[PDB]
Coordinates of C-alpha atoms (C1' of nucleotides) in Angstrom, one line a residue:
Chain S
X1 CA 22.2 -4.7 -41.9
X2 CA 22.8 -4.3 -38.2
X3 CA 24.4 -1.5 -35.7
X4 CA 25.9 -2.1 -32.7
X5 CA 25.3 0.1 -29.5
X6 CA 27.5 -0.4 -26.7
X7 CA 26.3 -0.4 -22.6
X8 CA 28.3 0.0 -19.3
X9 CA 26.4 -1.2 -16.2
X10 CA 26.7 0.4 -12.7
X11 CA 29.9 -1.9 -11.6
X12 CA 31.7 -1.5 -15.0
X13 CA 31.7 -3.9 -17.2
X14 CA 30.5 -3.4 -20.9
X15 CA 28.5 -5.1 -23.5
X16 CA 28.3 -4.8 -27.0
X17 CA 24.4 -5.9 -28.8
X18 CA 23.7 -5.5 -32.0
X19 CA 21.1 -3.7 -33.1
X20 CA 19.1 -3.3 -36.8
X21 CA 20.1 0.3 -37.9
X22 CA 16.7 1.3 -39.5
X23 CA 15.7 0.6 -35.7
X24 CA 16.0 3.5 -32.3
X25 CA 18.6 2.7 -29.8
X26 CA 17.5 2.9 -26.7
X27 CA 18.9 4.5 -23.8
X28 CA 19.3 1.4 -21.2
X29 CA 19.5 -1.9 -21.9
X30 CA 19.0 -4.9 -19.8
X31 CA 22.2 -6.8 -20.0
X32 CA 23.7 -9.8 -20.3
X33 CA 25.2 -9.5 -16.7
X34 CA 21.7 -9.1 -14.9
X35 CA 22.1 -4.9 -14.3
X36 CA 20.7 -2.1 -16.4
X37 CA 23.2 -0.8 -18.7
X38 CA 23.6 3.3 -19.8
X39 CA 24.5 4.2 -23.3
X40 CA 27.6 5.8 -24.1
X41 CA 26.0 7.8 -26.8
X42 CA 24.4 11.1 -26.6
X43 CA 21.3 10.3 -24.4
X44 CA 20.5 9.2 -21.7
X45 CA 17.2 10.9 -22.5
X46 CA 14.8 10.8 -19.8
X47 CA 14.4 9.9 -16.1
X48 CA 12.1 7.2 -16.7
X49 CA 8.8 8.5 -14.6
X50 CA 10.3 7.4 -11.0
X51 CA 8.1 7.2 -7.9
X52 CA 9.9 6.6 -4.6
X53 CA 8.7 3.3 -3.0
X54 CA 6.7 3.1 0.2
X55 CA 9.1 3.3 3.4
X56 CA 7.7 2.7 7.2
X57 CA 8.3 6.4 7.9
X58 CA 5.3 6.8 5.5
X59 CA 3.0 4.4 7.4
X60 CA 4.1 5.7 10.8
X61 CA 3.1 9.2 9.1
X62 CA -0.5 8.5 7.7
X63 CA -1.6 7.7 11.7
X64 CA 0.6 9.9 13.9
X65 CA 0.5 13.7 13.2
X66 CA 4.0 15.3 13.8
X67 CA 3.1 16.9 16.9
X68 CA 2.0 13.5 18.5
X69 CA 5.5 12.5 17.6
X70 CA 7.2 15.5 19.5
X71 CA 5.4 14.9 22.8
X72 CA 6.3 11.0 22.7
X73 CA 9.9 11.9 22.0
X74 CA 9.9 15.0 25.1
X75 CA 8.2 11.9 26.7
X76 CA 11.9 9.6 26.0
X77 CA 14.1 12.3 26.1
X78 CA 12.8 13.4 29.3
X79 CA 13.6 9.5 30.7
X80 CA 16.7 9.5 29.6
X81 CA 17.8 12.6 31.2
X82 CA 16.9 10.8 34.9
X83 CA 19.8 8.7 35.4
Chain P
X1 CA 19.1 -30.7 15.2
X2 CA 18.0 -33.7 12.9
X3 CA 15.6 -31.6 11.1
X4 CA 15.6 -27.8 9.6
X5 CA 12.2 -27.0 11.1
X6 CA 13.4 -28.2 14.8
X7 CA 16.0 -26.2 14.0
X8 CA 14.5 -22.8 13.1
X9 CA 11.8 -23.9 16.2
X10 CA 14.3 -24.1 18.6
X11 CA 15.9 -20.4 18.1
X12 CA 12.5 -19.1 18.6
X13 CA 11.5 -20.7 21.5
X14 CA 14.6 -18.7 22.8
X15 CA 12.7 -15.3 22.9
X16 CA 9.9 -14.9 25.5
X17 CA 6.1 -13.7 24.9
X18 CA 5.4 -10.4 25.1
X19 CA 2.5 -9.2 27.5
X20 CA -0.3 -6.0 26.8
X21 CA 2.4 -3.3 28.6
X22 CA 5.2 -4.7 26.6
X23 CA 3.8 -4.3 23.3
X24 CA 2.6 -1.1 24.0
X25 CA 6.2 -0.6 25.2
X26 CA 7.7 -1.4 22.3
X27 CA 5.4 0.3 19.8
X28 CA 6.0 3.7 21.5
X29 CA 10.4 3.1 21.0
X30 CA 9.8 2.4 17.3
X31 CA 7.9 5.4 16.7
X32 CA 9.8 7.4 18.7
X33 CA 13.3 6.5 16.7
X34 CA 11.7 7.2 13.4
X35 CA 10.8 10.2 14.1
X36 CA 13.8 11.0 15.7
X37 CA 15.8 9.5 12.7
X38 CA 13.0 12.1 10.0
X39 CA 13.7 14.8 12.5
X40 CA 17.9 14.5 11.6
X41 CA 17.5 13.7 8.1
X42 CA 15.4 16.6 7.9
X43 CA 18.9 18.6 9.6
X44 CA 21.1 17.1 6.7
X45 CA 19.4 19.0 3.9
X46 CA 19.4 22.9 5.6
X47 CA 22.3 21.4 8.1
X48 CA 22.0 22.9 12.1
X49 CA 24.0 20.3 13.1
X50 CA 22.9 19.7 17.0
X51 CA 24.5 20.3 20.3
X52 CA 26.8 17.1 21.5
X53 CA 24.6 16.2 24.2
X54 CA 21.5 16.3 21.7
X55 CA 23.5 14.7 18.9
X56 CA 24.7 11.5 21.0
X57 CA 20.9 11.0 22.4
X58 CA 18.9 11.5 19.3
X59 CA 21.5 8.5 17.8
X60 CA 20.4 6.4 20.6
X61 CA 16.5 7.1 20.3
X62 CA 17.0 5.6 17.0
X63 CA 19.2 2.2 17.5
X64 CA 16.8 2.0 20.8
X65 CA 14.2 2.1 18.0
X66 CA 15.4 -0.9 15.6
X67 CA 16.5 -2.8 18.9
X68 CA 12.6 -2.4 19.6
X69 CA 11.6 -3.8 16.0
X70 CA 13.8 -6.4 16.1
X71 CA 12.3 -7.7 19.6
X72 CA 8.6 -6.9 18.9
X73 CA 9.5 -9.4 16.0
X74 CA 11.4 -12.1 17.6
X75 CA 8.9 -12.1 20.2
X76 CA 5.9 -13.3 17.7
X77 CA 7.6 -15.6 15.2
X78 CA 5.7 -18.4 17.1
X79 CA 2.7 -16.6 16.0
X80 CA 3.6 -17.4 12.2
X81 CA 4.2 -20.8 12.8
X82 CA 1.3 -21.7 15.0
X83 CA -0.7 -20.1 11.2
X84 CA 1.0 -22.0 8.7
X85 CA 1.1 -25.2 10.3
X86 CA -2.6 -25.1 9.1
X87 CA -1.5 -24.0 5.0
X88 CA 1.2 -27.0 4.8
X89 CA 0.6 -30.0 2.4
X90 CA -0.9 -27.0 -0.8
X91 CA 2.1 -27.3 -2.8
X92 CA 4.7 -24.8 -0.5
X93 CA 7.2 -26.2 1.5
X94 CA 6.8 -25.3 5.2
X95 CA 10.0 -23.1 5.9
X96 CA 8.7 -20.9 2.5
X97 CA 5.3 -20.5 4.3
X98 CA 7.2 -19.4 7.3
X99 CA 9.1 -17.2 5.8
X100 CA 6.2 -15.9 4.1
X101 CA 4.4 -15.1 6.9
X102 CA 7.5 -13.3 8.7
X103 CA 7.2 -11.0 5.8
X104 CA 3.5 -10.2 6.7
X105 CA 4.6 -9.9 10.3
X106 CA 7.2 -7.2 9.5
X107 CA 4.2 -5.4 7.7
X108 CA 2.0 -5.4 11.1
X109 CA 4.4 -4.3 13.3
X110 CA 5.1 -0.9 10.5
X111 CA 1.9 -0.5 10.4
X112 CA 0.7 -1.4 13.9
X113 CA -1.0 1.0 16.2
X114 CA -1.0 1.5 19.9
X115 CA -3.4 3.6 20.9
X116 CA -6.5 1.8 19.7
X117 CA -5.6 -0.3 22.8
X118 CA -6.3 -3.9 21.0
X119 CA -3.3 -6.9 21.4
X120 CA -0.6 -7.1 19.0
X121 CA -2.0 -10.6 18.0
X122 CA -5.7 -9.6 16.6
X123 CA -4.1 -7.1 13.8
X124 CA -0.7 -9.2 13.2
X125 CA -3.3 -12.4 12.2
X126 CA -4.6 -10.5 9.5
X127 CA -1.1 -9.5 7.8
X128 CA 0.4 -12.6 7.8
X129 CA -2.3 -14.8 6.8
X130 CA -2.8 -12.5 4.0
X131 CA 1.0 -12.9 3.8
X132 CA 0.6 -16.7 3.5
X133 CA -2.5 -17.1 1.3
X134 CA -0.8 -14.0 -1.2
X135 CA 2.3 -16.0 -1.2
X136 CA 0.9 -19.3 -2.0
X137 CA -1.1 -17.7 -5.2
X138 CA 2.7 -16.5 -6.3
X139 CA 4.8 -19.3 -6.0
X140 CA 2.4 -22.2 -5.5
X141 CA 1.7 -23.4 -9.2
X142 CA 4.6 -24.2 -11.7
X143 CA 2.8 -22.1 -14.1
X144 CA 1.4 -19.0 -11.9
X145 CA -1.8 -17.5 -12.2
X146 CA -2.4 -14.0 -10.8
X147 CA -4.2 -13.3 -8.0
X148 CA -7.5 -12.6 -9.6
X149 CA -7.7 -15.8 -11.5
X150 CA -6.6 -17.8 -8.5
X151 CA -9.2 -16.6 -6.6
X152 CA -12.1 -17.5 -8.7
X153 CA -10.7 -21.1 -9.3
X154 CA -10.7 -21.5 -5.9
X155 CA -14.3 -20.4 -5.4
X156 CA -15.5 -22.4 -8.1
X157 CA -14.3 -25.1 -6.4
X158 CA -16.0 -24.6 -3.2
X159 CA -19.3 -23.9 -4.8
X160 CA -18.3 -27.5 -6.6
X161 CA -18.1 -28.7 -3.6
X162 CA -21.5 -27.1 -1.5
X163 CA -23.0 -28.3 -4.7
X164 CA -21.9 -31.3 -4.6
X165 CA -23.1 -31.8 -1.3
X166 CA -26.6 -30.6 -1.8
X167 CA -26.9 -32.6 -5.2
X168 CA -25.3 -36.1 -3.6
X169 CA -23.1 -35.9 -6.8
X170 CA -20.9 -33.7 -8.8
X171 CA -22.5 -30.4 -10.6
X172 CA -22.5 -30.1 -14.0
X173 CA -20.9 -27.4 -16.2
X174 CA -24.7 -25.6 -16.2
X175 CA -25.6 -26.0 -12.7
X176 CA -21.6 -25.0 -11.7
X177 CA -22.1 -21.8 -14.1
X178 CA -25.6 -21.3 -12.4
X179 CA -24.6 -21.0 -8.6
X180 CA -21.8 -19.2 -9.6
X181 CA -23.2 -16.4 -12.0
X182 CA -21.0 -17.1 -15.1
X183 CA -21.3 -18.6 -18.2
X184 CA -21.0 -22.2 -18.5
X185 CA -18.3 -21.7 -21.5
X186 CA -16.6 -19.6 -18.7
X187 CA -16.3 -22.5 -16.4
X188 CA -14.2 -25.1 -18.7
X189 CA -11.9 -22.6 -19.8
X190 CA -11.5 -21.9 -15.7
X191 CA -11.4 -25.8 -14.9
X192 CA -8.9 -25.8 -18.2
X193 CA -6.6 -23.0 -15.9
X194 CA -6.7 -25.0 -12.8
X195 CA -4.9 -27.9 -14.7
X196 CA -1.1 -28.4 -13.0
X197 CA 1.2 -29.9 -15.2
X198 CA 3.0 -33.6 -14.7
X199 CA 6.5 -34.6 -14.3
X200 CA 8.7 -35.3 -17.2
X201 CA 10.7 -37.3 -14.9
X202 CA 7.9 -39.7 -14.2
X203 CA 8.0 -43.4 -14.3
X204 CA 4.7 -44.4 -16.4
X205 CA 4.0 -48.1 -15.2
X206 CA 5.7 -49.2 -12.0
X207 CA 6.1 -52.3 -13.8
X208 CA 8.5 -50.8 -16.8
X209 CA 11.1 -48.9 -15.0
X210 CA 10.0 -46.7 -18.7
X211 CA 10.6 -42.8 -18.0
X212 CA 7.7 -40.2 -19.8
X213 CA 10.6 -38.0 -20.7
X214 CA 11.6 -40.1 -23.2
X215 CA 8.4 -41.5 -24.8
X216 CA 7.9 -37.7 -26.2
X217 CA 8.9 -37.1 -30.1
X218 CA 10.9 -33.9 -31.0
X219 CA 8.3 -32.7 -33.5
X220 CA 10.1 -30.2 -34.8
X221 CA 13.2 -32.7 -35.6
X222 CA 14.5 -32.4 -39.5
X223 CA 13.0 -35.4 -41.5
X224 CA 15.3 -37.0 -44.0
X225 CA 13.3 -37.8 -46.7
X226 CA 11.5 -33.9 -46.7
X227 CA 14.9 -32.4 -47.1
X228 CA 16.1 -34.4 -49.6
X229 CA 12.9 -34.2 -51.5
X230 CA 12.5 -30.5 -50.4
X231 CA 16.0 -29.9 -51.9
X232 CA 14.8 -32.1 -55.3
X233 CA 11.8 -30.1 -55.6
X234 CA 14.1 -26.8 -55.8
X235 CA 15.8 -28.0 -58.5
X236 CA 12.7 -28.8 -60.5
X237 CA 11.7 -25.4 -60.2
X238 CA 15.3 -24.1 -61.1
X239 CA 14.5 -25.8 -64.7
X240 CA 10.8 -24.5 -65.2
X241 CA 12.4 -21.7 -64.9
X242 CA 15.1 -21.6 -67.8
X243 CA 12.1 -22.5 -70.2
X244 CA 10.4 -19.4 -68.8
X245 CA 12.3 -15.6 -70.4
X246 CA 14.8 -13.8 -68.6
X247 CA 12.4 -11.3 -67.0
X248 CA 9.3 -13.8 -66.8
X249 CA 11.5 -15.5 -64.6
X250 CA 13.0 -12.8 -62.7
X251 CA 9.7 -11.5 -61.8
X252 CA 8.4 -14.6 -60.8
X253 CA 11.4 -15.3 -58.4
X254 CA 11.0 -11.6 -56.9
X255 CA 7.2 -11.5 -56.2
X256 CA 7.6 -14.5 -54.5
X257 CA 11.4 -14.1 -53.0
X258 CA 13.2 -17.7 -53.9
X259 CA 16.7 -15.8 -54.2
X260 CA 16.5 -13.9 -51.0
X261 CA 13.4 -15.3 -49.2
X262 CA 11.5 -12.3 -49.1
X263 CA 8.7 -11.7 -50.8
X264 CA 8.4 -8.3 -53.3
X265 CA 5.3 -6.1 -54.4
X266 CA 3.9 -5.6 -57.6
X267 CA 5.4 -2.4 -57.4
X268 CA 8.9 -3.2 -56.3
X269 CA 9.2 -5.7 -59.2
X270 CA 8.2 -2.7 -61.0
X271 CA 11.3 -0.2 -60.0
X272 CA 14.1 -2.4 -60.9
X273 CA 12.5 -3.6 -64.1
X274 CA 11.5 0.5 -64.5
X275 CA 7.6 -0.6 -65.1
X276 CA 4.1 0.7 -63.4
X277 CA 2.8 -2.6 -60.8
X278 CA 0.2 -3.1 -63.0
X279 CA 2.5 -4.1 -66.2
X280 CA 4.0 -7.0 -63.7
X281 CA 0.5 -7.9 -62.6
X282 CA 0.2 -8.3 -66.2
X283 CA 3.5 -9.9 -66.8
X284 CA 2.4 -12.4 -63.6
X285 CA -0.7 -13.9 -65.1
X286 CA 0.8 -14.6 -68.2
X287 CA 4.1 -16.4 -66.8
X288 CA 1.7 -18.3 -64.2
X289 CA -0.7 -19.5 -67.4
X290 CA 2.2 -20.6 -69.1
X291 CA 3.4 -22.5 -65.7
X292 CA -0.2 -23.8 -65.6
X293 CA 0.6 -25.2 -69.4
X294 CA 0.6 -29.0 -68.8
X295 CA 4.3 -29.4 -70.1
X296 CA 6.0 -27.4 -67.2
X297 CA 3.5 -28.7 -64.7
X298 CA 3.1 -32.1 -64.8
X299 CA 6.5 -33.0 -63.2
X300 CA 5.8 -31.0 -60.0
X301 CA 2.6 -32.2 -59.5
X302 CA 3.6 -34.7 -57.1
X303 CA 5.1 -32.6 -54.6
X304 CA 1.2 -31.2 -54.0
X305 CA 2.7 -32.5 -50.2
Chain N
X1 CA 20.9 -47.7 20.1
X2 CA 22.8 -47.9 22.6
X3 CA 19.8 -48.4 25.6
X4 CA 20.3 -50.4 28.6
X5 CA 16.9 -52.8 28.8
X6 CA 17.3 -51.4 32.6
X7 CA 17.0 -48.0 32.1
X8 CA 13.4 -47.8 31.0
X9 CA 11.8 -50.0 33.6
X10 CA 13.2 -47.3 35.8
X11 CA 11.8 -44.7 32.8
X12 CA 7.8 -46.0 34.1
X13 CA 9.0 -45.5 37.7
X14 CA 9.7 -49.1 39.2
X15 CA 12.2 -49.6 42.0
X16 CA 15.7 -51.5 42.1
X17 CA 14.6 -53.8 44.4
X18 CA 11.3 -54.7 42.0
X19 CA 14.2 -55.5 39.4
X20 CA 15.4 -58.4 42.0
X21 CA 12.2 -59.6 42.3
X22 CA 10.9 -60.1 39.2
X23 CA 14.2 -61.0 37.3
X24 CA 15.0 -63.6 39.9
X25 CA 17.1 -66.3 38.0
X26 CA 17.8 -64.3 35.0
X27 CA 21.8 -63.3 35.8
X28 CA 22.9 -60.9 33.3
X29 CA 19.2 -59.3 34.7
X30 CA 20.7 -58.9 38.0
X31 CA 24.6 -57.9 36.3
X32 CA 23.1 -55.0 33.9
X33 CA 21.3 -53.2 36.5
X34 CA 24.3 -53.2 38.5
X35 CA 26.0 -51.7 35.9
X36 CA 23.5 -49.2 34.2
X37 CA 25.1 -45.9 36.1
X38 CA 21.2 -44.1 35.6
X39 CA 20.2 -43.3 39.6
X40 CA 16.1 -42.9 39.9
X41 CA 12.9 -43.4 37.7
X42 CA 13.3 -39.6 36.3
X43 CA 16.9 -39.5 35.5
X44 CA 16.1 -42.5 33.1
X45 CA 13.6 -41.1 31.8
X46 CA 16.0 -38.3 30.5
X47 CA 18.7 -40.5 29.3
X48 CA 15.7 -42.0 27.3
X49 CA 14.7 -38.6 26.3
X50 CA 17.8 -36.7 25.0
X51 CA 18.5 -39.6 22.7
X52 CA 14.9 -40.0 21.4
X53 CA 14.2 -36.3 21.3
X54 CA 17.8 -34.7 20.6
X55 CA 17.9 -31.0 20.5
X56 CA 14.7 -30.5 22.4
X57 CA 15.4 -29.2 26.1
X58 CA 12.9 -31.5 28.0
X59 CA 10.5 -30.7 30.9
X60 CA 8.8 -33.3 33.7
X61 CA 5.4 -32.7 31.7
X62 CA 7.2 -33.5 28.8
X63 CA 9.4 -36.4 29.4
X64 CA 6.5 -38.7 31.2
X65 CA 4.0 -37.9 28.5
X66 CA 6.9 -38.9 25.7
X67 CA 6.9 -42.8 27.0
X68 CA 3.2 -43.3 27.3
X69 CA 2.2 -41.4 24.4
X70 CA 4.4 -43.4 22.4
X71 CA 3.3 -46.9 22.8
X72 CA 1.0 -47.0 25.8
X73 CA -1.9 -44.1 24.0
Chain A
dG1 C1' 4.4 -3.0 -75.3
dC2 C1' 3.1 -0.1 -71.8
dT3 C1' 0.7 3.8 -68.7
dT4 C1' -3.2 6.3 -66.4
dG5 C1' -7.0 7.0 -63.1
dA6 C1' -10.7 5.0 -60.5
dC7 C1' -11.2 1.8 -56.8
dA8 C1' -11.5 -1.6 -53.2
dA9 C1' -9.3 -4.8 -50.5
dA10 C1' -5.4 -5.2 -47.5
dA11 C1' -2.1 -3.5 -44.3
dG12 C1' -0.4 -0.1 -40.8
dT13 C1' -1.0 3.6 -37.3
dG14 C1' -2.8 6.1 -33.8
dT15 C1' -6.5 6.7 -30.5
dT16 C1' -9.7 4.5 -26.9
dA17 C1' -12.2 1.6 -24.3
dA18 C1' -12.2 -2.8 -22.1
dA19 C1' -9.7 -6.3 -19.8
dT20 C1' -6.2 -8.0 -17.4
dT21 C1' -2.7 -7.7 -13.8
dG22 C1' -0.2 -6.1 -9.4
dT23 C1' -0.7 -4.5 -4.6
dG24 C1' -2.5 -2.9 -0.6
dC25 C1' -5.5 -4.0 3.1
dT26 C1' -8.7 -6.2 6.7
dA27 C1' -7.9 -3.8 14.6
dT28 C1' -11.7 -9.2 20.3
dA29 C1' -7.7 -12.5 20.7
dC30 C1' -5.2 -16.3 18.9
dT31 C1' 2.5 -17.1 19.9

DNA sequence: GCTTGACAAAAGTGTTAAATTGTGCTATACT
């Protein structure tokens, strides 16, 4: 009383788990090799409510406005043009 | 060197302190070659590739930039060390606290600002002591706790301890629950939490060279005489079972699953004998009466358990 | 190992000819000195160090301290 | 031997509030 679905992780490989088949397949499925695995059915339904993480650019943004940043950059440039 | 510590220590004695000027220095670079690096990536979407001249400076602005990160860091990893000296001997090794920290030092140099004018050291403290103290509440225990539940175990126990001091003995569960403002019922299952587990590995008894490990049974081993009784008992009920008729029987070995294991409902039994549930219900008392009828019972009395 | 009984008495700063005075009849006292190659009070005092303290650069506040704060604090 | 309707306990489902859990942060100066 069991289907099997099949999943290919992001280097290749492949992995077969059996399922019940009165039971949903999902889409990805942690596998046995450590990576997230896609299935090779129809969906691949959803993007799976992503948020980009927090990257220093963000904290260096919250403090200096962009036009802070333009004068402290005319303030390297500027050195680096006297050689 | 001998040691691993002496020989993380001596690679960062190698870098030199950083004065006011420097910092400040340095803080201005990093900036300067992120923005310069969001100012680029901002030309890769809607393209405008720059002049030569323009291109070749703005990719030095930003290596300048990670050269200044990197030295801003390798300038105060004796400031991580000189704070987890103090956090040794609480169940993390001292490299892991180390490392810890540098991970809190990373965050105060992103976040770090230079124009409120104040030493790199006063707002770095704060990051990786968090960094430490965060880290221990993580990795610390065998079986973690969150952060929230390690931090009221920890002020139970100073309030324990300023408690104990002004009572010249230990608190009890009431007077613990009283300074504290919790229930005293909420203070044994906290003390229950703080438990750390022991060492299966352990030698109980210096004198018995006797390991714990293997003092401990395997209570869910298969006993011998169960099974074989078990496996007796289901062929008792095999013969009750002949004297009952073929559908008495049948039902009685559906509603309660012996074939498959699973258990059926009244009206399940009911669709493969083509019956309403209530004529099994009525079919069930009668087959269990007649079970109950001392001539089919009294040989599996004894396997009450 | 390896420490030439010598060496330290020049490691707290006593003179050669201090070593001829006080060893007097001992012979192999007189013999070692002559052959311990460590010139001056400091100089032992590093020879003592490196060995005791390998993989630490030393420093004059640092080698001094190391002989008194081991046995004579 | 059997079925029908009324009926209440029991079992699932979905919807919400409370709780539990994860993470970010703290700017005298401190290496």
């Amino acid at each position: 009383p069991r289907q099997v679905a099949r999943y290919r992780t992001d280097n290749g490989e492949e992995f077969d788990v059996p399922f019940a088949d009165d039971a949903e397949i999902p889409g990805t499925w942690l596998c046995r090799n450590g990576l997230e695995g896609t299935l090779i059915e129809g969906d691949v339904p959803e993007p799976k409510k992503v948020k980009p993480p927090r990257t220093h650019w963000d904290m260096l943004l919250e403090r200096r406005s962009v036009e802070e940043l333009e004068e402290l950059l005319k303030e390297r440039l500027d050195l680096i043009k006297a050689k | 060197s001998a040691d691993s510590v002496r020989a993380y220590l001596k690679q960062i004695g190698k870098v030199a302190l950083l004065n006011a000027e420097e910092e400040v220095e340095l803080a201005k670079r990093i900036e300067a070659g992120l923005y310069a690096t969001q100012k680029l990536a901002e030309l890769a979407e809607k393209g405008e590739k720059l002049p030569v001249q323009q291109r070749r400076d703005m990719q030095w602005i930003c290596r300048d930039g990670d050269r200044a990160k990197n030295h801003l860091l390798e300038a105060n990893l004796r400031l991580v060390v000189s704070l987890a000296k103090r956090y040794t001997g609480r169940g993390m090794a001292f490299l892991d606290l180390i490392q810890e920290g540098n991970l809190g030092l990373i965050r105060a140099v992103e976040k770090f600002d230079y124009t409120k004018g104040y030493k790199f050291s006063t707002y770095a403290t704060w990051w990786i002591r968090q960094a430490i103290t965060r880290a221990m509440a993580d990795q610390a225990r065998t079986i973690r706790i969150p952060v929230h539940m390690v931090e009221v175990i920890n002020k139970l126990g100073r309030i324990q301890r300023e408690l104990l001091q002004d009572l010249g003995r230990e608190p009890t569960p009431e007077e613990l629950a009283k300074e504290m403002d919790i229930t005293p019922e909420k203070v044994l299952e906290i003390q229950q939490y703080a438990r750390e587990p022991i060492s299966l590995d352990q030698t109980i008894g210096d004198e018995g060279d006797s390991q714990l490990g293997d003092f401990i049974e395997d209570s869910e081993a298969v006993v011998a005489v169960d099974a074989v009784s078990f496996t007796l008992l289901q062929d008792q009920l095999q013969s009750v079972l002949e004297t009952l008729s073929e559908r008495e029987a049948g039902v009685v070995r559906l509603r309660f699953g012996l074939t498959d294991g699973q258990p059926r409902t009244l009206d399940e039994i009911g669709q493969v004998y083509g019956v309403t549930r209530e004529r099994i219900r009525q079919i069930e008392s009668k087959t269990m009466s007649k079970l109950r009828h001392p001539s089919r019972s009294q040989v599996l009395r004894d396997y009450l358990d | 190992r390896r420490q030439p009984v010598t060496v330290l008495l020049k490691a707290l700063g006593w003179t050669n000819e201090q070593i001829v005075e006080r060893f007097g009849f001992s012979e192999i006292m007189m013999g070692t000195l002559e052959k311990d190659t460590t010139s001056g009070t400091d100089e032992a005092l590093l020879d003592i160090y490196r060995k005791l303290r390998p993989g630490e650069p030393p420093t004059k506040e640092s080698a001094q301290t190391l002989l008194e704060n081991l046995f004579f604090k």
